[PDB]
Amino acid sequence: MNEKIEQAIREMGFKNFTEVQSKTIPLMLQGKNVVVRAKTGSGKTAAYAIPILELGMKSLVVTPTRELTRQVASHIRDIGRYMDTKVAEVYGGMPYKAQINRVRNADIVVATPGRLLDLWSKGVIDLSSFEIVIIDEADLMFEMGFIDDIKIILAQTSNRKITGLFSATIPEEIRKVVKDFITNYEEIEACIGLANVEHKFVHVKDDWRSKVQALRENKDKGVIVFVRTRNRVAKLVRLFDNAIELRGDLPQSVRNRNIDAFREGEYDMLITTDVASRGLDIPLVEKVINFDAPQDLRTYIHRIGRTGRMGRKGEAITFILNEYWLEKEVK
């Protein structure tokens, strides 16, 4: 709301806030830690840059690459053009002297993890001085082999009051880090995934027989079917001879083997509960069937996230008994 920031974004062509921005900004301004599931182009940069500039607290933004470090730093300087703040960039390959001069008296530091820790080790950077810490594209950093750096950074930034982690996906390793380092955080997600899928809703008469019958009408191969409980998965798989199941009590080796059979085309359907498929690598498919409607929109989005093979549009079919709220919200 600072007039200097509002004027700057208006000059940059601001018209409306993106979904990620609308949800994230208010929460960070309230001092809440956030874990945001968002991809490039979602407007995530301004989502954390606005709060950083508005609060005026010394901040650190950790980025995976030199390119992103430069783009983020530039965007922050642009939005904060009238805030008289010093934004410094830190990344590999930069001449040492220039690097030192930039970090000197910086209010906001955007940096790749490796170089940041090197400067920290040499005593050039005081990680305990940062009150806001942002981890941007945590999943990419994990895949690049930087997860231990992220752990050290979060452990050493001992005075951080607001911590935000942005990532398109949340692998188990990242989930662990968030739990051990980010205190009572707000989980934020965009509903963009809804646009890449055709949503179909089938109204059924009851919670079992009519659902079994509706599923028998399925003509497609390589479909994932989500069910509410382990008991229902067990009973459903016993009614279809072209289905393999995933249950929470099956060791991960058995589940991975069942997924392999599905991938090999040995079964037309993979029947699972949300718990049983969580954190497992499953091939992207074209269609998902919600035999049982999910309990909330977030779960719906996560399930339909299983579609989109080869970047194509997906299809989701949900059997609706009395969960009319889902149809309404999705539409």
UniProtKB/TrEMBL annotation:
Recorded GO CC terms: cytosol
SUPFAM superfamilies found in the cross-reference section:
P-loop containing nucleoside triphosphate hydrolases
Q: Do the record's keywords include Transport?
A: no
**Entries under InterPro entries matching the protein:** DEAD/DEAH_box_helicase_dom, DEAD/DEAH_RhlB, DEAD_box_RNA_helicase, Helicase_ATP-bd, Helicase_C-like, P-loop_NTPase
This protein's UniProt keywords:
ATP-binding, Helicase, Hydrolase, Nucleotide-binding
> Any idea where the Helicase ATP-binding domain is?
25-188
Recorded protein name is DEAD-box ATP-dependent RNA helicase
Organism taxonomic ancestry: Archaea, Thermoproteota, Thermoprotei, Sulfolobales, Sulfolobaceae
Please name the gene that encodes this protein.
ST2459
